[PDB]
Each structure stands twice: as structure tokens, then as C-alpha cells.
Scaffold this active site. Structure first.
Site, PDB file in Angstrom:
ATOM      1  N   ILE D 146       0.664  -1.274   0.411  1.00 13.77           N
ATOM      2  CA  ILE D 146       0.545   0.068   0.183  1.00 13.77           C
ATOM      3  C   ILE D 146       0.807   0.773   0.020  1.00 13.77           C
ATOM      4  O   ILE D 146       1.391   1.756   1.039  1.00 13.77           O
ATOM      5  CB  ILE D 146      -1.011  -0.023   1.355  1.00 13.77           C
ATOM      6  CG1 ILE D 146      -1.799  -0.787   1.697  1.00 13.77           C
ATOM      7  CG2 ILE D 146      -1.729   1.182   1.130  1.00 13.77           C
ATOM      8  CD1 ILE D 146      -2.331  -1.634   0.589  1.00 13.77           C
ATOM      9  N   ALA D 174       3.134  -1.966   3.875  1.00 13.27           N
ATOM     10  CA  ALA D 174       2.897  -0.152   3.021  1.00 13.27           C
ATOM     11  C   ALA D 174       4.474   0.257   3.279  1.00 13.27           C
ATOM     12  O   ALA D 174       5.228   0.411   3.962  1.00 13.27           O
ATOM     13  CB  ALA D 174       1.652  -0.270   3.814  1.00 13.27           C
ATOM     14  N   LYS D 175       4.363   1.295   2.437  1.00 22.40           N
ATOM     15  CA  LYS D 175       5.523   2.681   2.551  1.00 22.40           C
ATOM     16  C   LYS D 175       3.965   2.909   3.418  1.00 22.40           C
ATOM     17  O   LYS D 175       3.428   3.928   2.550  1.00 22.40           O
ATOM     18  CB  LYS D 175       5.424   2.488   0.874  1.00 22.40           C
ATOM     19  CG  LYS D 175       6.470   4.160   1.060  1.00 22.40           C
ATOM     20  CD  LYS D 175       6.336   4.786  -0.288  1.00 22.40           C
ATOM     21  CE  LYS D 175       7.024   6.176  -0.752  1.00 22.40           C
ATOM     22  NZ  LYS D 175       7.390   6.745  -1.154  1.00 22.40           N
ATOM     23  N   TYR D 176       5.024   3.861   4.672  1.00 22.35           N
ATOM     24  CA  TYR D 176       4.032   4.529   5.563  1.00 22.35           C
ATOM     25  C   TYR D 176       4.860   5.947   5.651  1.00 22.35           C
ATOM     26  O   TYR D 176       5.453   5.742   5.421  1.00 22.35           O
ATOM     27  CB  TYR D 176       3.780   3.427   6.119  1.00 22.35           C
ATOM     28  CG  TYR D 176       2.710   3.545   7.784  1.00 22.35           C
ATOM     29  CD1 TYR D 176       1.676   3.162   7.668  1.00 22.35           C
ATOM     30  CD2 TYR D 176       3.289   4.255   8.925  1.00 22.35           C
ATOM     31  CE1 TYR D 176       0.592   3.362   9.211  1.00 22.35           C
ATOM     32  CE2 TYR D 176       2.842   4.474   9.629  1.00 22.35           C
ATOM     33  CZ  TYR D 176       1.160   3.924   9.862  1.00 22.35           C
ATOM     34  OH  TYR D 176       0.474   4.509  10.983  1.00 22.35           O
TER      35      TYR D 176
END
Lengths: 325, 325, 325, 326
Positions: D146, D174-176
Site C-alpha cells: 500500500i 505498506a510504504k508508510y
């Protein structure tokens, strides 16, 4: 008796609260130049303005002490001597404080209050409606001008809000910004005199010449001849159907305002609302607004230059239109 | 002598300003229940809280009269009798008003002020820095807690701001929200005790156990045993390296808060900050917060239900953790 | 040869991209109902519309495959047979893709493209200006309509932008929203036919009757008689000076639109732009828009009800104004 | 077979899409420097990176043609030869286009796709959830990362969204961005490897050392030794309890990034996301990112200077930490 919308016509000018030289210092306690206040009032009446508003954002409602406000309004009322309507400003953080101030300033002799909403917590529609109903119940002798500034007061003053305000007899006018939804607001609120900004008056008056008979002006503090001319030329145009001259004045005004906003941006202007207006008036030289009261006494130099250019442009307009009057 | 960051440890609870039954009416003039105030203070000291903050947003700094504030702070100071540190709140529309109020409430006997920024006009970085420097110069005996709420005060309290505040000896703590930039803010501001919200304390304490020794709590007004347990279990975990029990308390707290915000949204909560906190405390039954002062006395029923559920959840936590204490 | 602003007059209707019953399914590959497309085009020409726009937001420019777009535009072009001007929509994520699509759809026989800006990364003023210059250089035969929607495209289409667009001969018109800054935009951009929304046409035409001769309509997809009547009545008002009848039509239109926006909010409408417009058209029964292509096929039921009410209101207007025609 | 969260550890670097000299011109048609692509991939594997992501915002997912993307991914896949996991990016304006692209790039040999949401119309929670479920149904062999960027994609990726994504087996990472709500998101989404930005890895790893074992890095494109050192020193610290060295690296990284954002402002950075990242990498000299594809090829000069300073700072870090590594 109390003002109604029928009494609100023509050029309504918003005056600053002139400050003494030490006003930027938090130590200073009586920072209102009361003689300059009186002088400005007399000059505006002499120019033929139809009414005076005060103590909005650039009027430093937020930064004046209560003693300064009483003295300011006293001076104005004694200078005006009933010759034109005058609205003070009593916006505060809560309903009880607003009521207390509105009572005193109406007793001193203002005809009404230019009133925003408490803005620490963002208001919703029912809260805002109840706020204005509360003030009108508490102070039934006071006329109310809605100060509809979403940047300052967070609330967006939406369409249903105007429908509700038209049911409050004390609410007779509004300081209004963009005219994008004006056609509809007029329909929803038949009993309110909506005042567009001077730059939008030409357009608004063409949309609804029966209802749009008045406007508000900050540019008049750089020399009021431009606003007086616009008023006069729009009355003529409504009668003759020839709008060319009113349009030319309106175009001049827009050009004079073109450098005022930092990067064209209303929200960036709103951070420096006070310093930029005061720097503009100071540059035009028609009045001496003076330094800003704390905390709002720091403005980037780039932005000041734009405000000063605007001031010089409005002063040029005043010179030009003084001759045509 | 004046508090420093070294003196700020453990659980700091933010109390409401308890209101009398007629407090929603703009006609009422003495709306503080002073006996309930005293009772809450004594209950908090008896529960073992480390300090008390007051008169933020839900504490109704905005909607109290000046007479109500003096009576409230007097009552608190006389009840506390020096046993714990106490911070009042003096946020106002300008620097001179802030200074006047801070002087009086410090003289009455508060140790410091929880202070946001004037918010009619949105402040920029230099304006905000100068504001806090001005207050600290004017009232050098007062400790200052930065009330870093961007929704209320518009200013976003960015990284360079904290670097500047660490140079003001009077600034000793901050009521801090999201901990996204906490690692960096700690580096930029070595002399400030940053207080995360109780729900974020577990995480913040693990990031920097030497610096993050205190937190603020609204949930304690629903029964303080949960906050006391969290404090105690985090002290133990820092020593043993076993964080499991602190984590379980922290997870319970997050769950109790899960229905508080309308649609999960901090900005929508911020419109009803006052009514939702007060409705939550009322539902928990540990104290009687009472109705909200005008204008902020209307909250949609859907949202109230969520706040009431949260209150009941915190009351359940208080029961559970009272036994484990 | 290429359209100019002089050629753009009267009622310009924005058509949906009619969908087959399986169109909400990501598995479906030919979801355009080409026969319904042809039928709508012929009905619009037969009603007397002056031009057709397509493939904006609710026209599902974003969710159609490239094969669907070619078939749609082919069908429209072969149905129109040169009888009215037609603009397709070629907004995409980058300049090269926009150029590729504009070339093919102009070759198929569209007269121009209704074009927003790439919106993954928010554009600044110089980027946006260069984008439109690039497309105009690459496809000099194509007329361009600026699709000035800040919610969709993030860029706010400010005043200096219009000054720049007036220098591109291919840019001949703009789908414009709020008319707050229209007076000035007209001055800055003499070579562009600005199209207000139908609800704002009355006001805009009164502001500048020489320049404001055309408008865009979504409401016409619920029955075009209302838009045709407005056009006709405004031409008479400009000649006679009697605006009463045009005003009454305009007021009816505003009332029909009054339940369309969720909670009055343009930004909340913009999240459900596609489903709400399609649900409205479906409720009015003049055409069959069909289900929405993924991912935009879920709309809260509360909001749908408002859109359906609006549809029924526009269908009622169509009945009323069909008789007066 | 398909990656899971258990397979995602250590330093994941996001590569640019290197461009040829004519790439700013709308007339140019094959603007990917495929040899520089291959060179970067081999250098990253040789530096010891654990995985490679591509085709996010600064990777110019938005501005590449479909032919360019295929050649880029082909080159990467043939260079990698299965040695490390690779995620391409397939964000597009609608679900069908996303599925079409994801199918082809997975077939070429990417392990997964770094995927944002369609952003012409702002998505609500149910729309977004259904979007990721459709792509996972349509392409069950693909792992999904994500790409949780609210500035780019308008949607804010809120807490309930993560709860829903943890039910999709294909969603593994996820790239957060900001770690303000990370403690909670970890609880709501047990099956996802959340990747904080490298500057936040130190803090996130201390919050939850069992779950936070990986991070993403743009700074590695200025020289990856800094990211490798951080990874290694955090592994050591989790074991010893001595965090001082990891903290020092993390502080260096924050300082190197301190001039990157125009006026400190993430939203102003986001307007020039592509040009600023590419100018930074160009200044550091470890790779040649090249000019930006239209329309995003204009950046104010003031802002470029800040990005270039950041590049030079990261290059200095690479020099320093290259010596400490061996």
C-alpha cells in the site's frame, strides 16, 4: 429608532484604529491616537460617506484593551454627532463577553456592531445561528452587521445560515466577501443589505440593482474620492443603462489592489491582514494608521512592498477622481 | 522557586471547569460550581496525580468570565495548598490580555499557565515565537506549558518553533498531540518536558525513556486509576525491560477512546471539543462537569452517543485498575 | 477550420457516458451503451442545444478504457454528422498521454477537448501554463476547453493562469465554476468564452451581457427544455431589459439543485461526483446513464436520495418548460 | 511463490526511473535509460539491500508511457535474476487499468506492486477497500504494498482501512509516512509489514521491535551505506539494548534531510516531489536520475538549492558510513 436594511445605502468605509508610536510594545497601555481618530471621522463625513464601520480584523478588535475600545468609540460618537450611522465591533471568544461589550458600546452611542463569531472552537450552523439570536435577544436596540470572514472566524457562513439571519430583525447588513453565491443569498435573506467589497460592487449591482445599493471600502482610507465616484456613477448607470464609466472605475480599483495579497493568496493575506492594511494606508498618506498592537506586528518585507504599492496606487486614484468630482 | 522540566513527571490530569445547572444560559453570571471544583482537586491528589492542568479547550478557557476564572483558580489554589503543581490557562486574543491574566492568576497562586496562541489572525513562526518571549519577559515567575493545538489555534507549532522555545527558561513543558515528529522535537528542544496524550505515552516512553517521563490525561476525569496504573507500570517496564503489562493498559485506553471522535475525525471532534468531553465525563460518573457555557452548548445526538460510550468504557477501566492498585 | 470563442454560444450540455448493466464489474470490457449514446445525441440536437461536451468527471473520463473512449467518440461523431460542435475529454496523468489521446479523438472527428490538468502531483502555475501550451503545440487543429475544477485537479486555476491562456489561440472556452472572480477573469482573458454553470448564467449574463452568451448544463440530461428556455429568455432580456422571466427560470433551477450536494458541501459532492450525477439522471428518466465503472460505484444511501430528488425536480421543470416552448 | 510479511525485512530502497537527456520534451518516446537502470539495480544488490521498490511518485509512475514501463521492469527483472524481491508500481486512474498493468508487470517477473488509489475523484473508505480487494482478486499471485500517500492520492488511509487490508492475504506491506498512529495501526493490521521512512525507523523500531524490522529509503539513492549501517546497528541494538549508535545514524539522516522540504512544508514538497528528489540524487552523484518527464519539469530555483544541499549531505553520510561498514 433602530436601523433597517432600507437605511443602508452607498459607501460604507471601514476605518482603522489609529495607533500611537509605542503601540507595538506590550508595555504600552493607551495606544489609541484619539485626535487622529476624530480627524479621520470628520474627513470621511466631509467626503460624503454614508456610514462608518470599525473594529474588524485590521481595525484590531482583537488586540485593543477594553479601555482603548471605550475611548475610541466615545471619540467617534462625539465627533459624528448623529450625522451618519456608525457600527463598532464586539467580536469576542464567547457570547457573554460579546453581549457585555455590545451593551456598553451601544450605550455610548454606536448604532450597531459588526460581529463575527467566536473562533477558538469552530462553530457549526446551529451554534452560529443561536449565537446571533442570543446577542439580538440580549441587546435588542443594536443593529447587527454580520462579519462574514471564514479565514478569521473558521465558520463558512453557508446558505442556510443566511436564511436564518433574515428572520432576526436586528440583523440588517453583512460585510460580505466573494459574490459567487450572492444571487442565492439575496433570495434566501430578503431583509439584509449585503455589502460587497468595493471591487465587486460593479458586478453585484448589475446582478441585482434593486438590492445591491451599498458596499464596503477599505480603499477609502487611502483617499475616499474613488469610492464616492463609484457610488455616484453606479447610481447614474442604474438610471441611464450606461455602465461604461462605472466599469472603468471598478477596473482601476482592481488594478490598485492587484499587489496587495502575498502571491495572490487570500489565506496568506489573512495571516498578515492587520500589518498589510496598515502599511497600505500609511503609504497612501491620507491618514496615519500607525504600528500594530501585539502580537501581530511582524510582516515579511516582500509582502509590505506589495501593500505599499497598493497604497500608492489608491492615492493616485484619489487624486484622479478628486478632480472628476 | 519556578518549576523546571526536571520537576515534571508522571500523570498530569486536565480538569474541566465544573458548571452549575444554569450555565448554558447567557443570562447566568456565576456558573462555576466551586464546591465540585474543590472535590475534584482533592480526589485527584488523593489518587496520586503528579500535577494538574486546567482551562484548555474543554476546560472552557474561552467561555468563562474573568470573575469566574479568578474564583475557580482561587478555589483550586486553596484546595491544593502547595501539594502538587498547578497550571491555569490564560490564552486570549492578544499579548496584553494574556499578560494581564497570567499576572493575576500567578499572584493568586498557580505555578504556571497552559498557553496557546491568539487565533483571530493565524500566526506565523516569528509572531508566535515573539508572543511566548513577550509573556515570559512580562511574567518571569510563571512556568509556561505550550498548548500545541493546531485546530484551536491555527498555528501548526512546527519544528523550528520548538528550537526557539527551548531557549526560553520559563517554557518547561508542552501539551503535545501526535507523536509523529517527537523524536526530532526532543532533539531540537532539550529543556522541555513533552507531554504526550496518555494513549501515546507507551509508544513515546519506549522511543525515549529518559526524556518521556510524564503525560497528560483527560481520561482520568472518568476515574484516574487507569492513568496511575499506566504511570506505575511504565516506571517498572523501564527498569525491567518487560513492557507487556504497560502495553495492555495502553491498548485498553485506545479502545476506550475509539468511539469518542465523530467518524474517527480529529477536526470534527474539534468542532464539538467541549460538549463531547463534558458529555463523556458526565456519562462516566466520577465527576459532574455540567452543561457547556455559550456559545458551545449544541452537539449532534449521534456524536454524544459515541462520547457517552467512551465515558462508560473509561469508567469500566477505572473499576478494573482500582482493584489491581 | 477550428472553432473560436465567437462560435461558442447558447446552451452547451455535458453528456454522461451511458453504461451497460455489467459496467460496475471490473471484469467487463465493453461497458459503453453505444445505442443509448446515439439516442441521447439525437435528442439533444433535436432539442436545439448549441454544442455538446463529454468525458469530464461524471462522464467517467477516468474510468473508461481507451477502446471504450474511441467507440464512444466514433458513435457521437457519426450521429452528429457535423451538425453541432462536439468536445471530447482527454485529461490524463501526463502530457504525452493527453497528446496521444487528443490526436486520435480529433482525427475521429471531435472539434476539441475538454481538458483538466494531471493531478497525481499538484501543479503550480508555470507547470499548468506549459501543459496547455504543450498540448496546443502538439495538436494545433484542436480547440481546447479548460476544465477548471480544483477539487478534481487540485490546481486552483487562478487569475494569472487565465491571462496566460488568453494567449493560446487554441483555448477558446472554459467550463467554469463559481463566478466570484468572473468580472476580472473576463478582463484578463478577452479571447475565451467563459461558460458558467446554468444556475449562474442569469447572474453572469447580467454582469457582462456582451461576453457571457453561453453556459454549460448537466441538468439538461434530466430534460433539456429548462436550459433551452433559459437561453431564449436571456436573449430577450438582453434586448428588452426585462429580466423577470429569466430570473424565475434561474430560481427554479437553483431549487431543483438544492438537494444534490451532500450537506450543501461541494467537496463532499466531489467524492461522489459520478454516482450522484448518474443517480440523478436515472431518477429523471429522460436518459439511462446506467451504473458507474470501478472504482467509483459506491455511494451512501442518504446522498443518493438527495440526488434522486434533484432528478425528479429537473424532470418536473422539463415538463413545465416543454409546454412554454 | 508469493511474498508474505515474514519475508519483508531490512532496507528497501525506492529507485528512480533514470531518464535520457531529452526526457523533458513531450516529443520524446523512449526516455528510459535502461543501462543506468541495470547499473543501479546491481549496485543496490551489491550494497546488500533487502528489496527494491519502484514507480512511486518520484519514480514517475504518472509520466511514463506503457512501453517505457515494460522495458524498465524487464530490465530490472533480468538484472535481478531472482536475487531480491522487486515491486513495480501500477497506480492508475481506475481499477481496470490497474489490473491490466499489474497482470503484465507481474508476468514479466515483478513480485508485487506498490499501489496507491485512483485520485481524480477522492475515494472514501469503502471505495478504497473495494479497490484493493478487486486488484487482489484479479491478480492473486501479486503481492501488494500500500502506497499510503494522502497528498498524492487524496484519501487519508485511516485506521479502519488498515483493519480491512489485514484481511487481504496479498497485502503484505505498506510504504508508510508519519508514525503518529503506527502503534495502533500495527494492532489493527497484524499481517502487514509497515515500512516507516528511514528517518523514522529508529523510533518505530523502538516502539515495536518485533514488528518493525524493515524500512524504506530514498536517501540510499545518494549512496546506500547509510541505510545499510542503520539496518545493521538497529539489529545489534535490539539484541544488546544499546541504542546510542543507531540514534546517531538516525540523527545524521534527519540533518541530511533538513533542507529538502521547501519551507519545512510536506505539502509544498509534494508539488515538486519529482523534481526535488531527482535534483537531490543528481547532486549526490551516486546515480544519474536525469530530467523529469512532462509535465513536472519546472521547479523554483530556491527549492532546488535545498534539494541539492540534501544530496551533498547524504553523499557525505555515504562516505562516512562506507568506512565504518568495513
Amino acid at each position: 429608532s433602530r436601523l433597517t436594511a432600507e437605511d443602508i445605502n452607498g459607501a460604507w468605509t471601514i476605518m482603522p484604529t489609529p495607533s500611537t508610536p509605542d503601540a507595538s510594545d506590550w508595555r504600552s497601555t493607551a495606544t489609541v491616537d484619539l485626535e487622529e481618530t476624530a480627524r479621520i471621522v470628520e474627513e470621511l463625513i466631509a467626503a460624503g460617506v454614508n456610514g462608518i464601520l470599525s473594529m474588524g480584523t485590521f481595525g484590531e478588535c482583537a488586540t485593543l484593551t477594553w479601555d482603548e475600545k471605550r475611548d475610541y468609540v466615545s471619540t467617534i460618537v462625539e465627533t459624528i454627532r448623529g450625522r451618519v450611522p456608525y457600527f463598532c465591533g464586539t467580536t469576542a471568544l464567547n457570547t457573554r463577553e460579546v453581549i457585555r461589550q455590545t451593551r456598553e458600546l451601544i450605550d455610548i452611542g454606536a448604532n450597531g456592531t459588526m460581529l463575527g463569531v467566536p473562533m477558538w472552537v469552530k462553530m457549526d450552523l446551529p451554534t452560529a445561528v443561536q449565537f446571533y439570536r442570543d446577542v439580538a435577544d440580549a441587546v435588542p436596540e443594536a443593529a447587527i452587521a454580520i462579519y462574514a470572514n471564514p479565514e478569521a472566524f473558521k465558520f463558512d457562513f453557508p446558505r442556510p445560515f443566511w436564511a436564518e439571519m433574515s428572520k432576526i430583525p436586528q440583523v440588517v447588513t453583512a460585510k460580505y466577501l466573494g459574490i459567487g453565491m450572492l444571487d442565492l443569498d439575496l433570495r434566501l435573506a430578503p431583509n439584509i443589505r449585503f455589502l460587497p467589497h468595493e471591487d465587486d460592487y460593479y458586478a453585484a449591482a448589475r446582478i441585482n440593482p434593486e438590492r445591491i445599493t451599498a458596499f464596503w471600502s477599505s480603499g477609502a482610507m487611502c483617499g475616499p474620492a474613488t469610492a464616492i465616484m463609484l457610488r455616484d456613477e453606479v447610481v447614474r448607470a442604474k438610471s441611464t443603462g450606461d455602465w461604461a464609466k462605472a466599469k472603468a472605475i471598478s477596473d482601476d480599483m482592481r488594478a490598485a489592489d492587484s499587489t496587495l495579497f502575498p502571491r495572490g493568496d487570500f489565506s496568506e493575506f489573512s495571516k498578515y491582514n492587520i500589518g498589510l492594511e496598515k502599511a497600505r494606508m500609511d503609504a497612501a498618506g491620507w491618514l496615519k494608521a500607525g504600528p500594530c498592537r501585539p502580537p501581530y506586528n511582524l510582516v515579511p518585507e516582500d509582502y509590505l512592498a506589495g501593500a505599499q504599492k497598493s497604497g500608492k496606487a489608491w492615492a493616485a486614484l484619489h487624486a484622479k477622481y478628486s478632480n472628476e468630482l
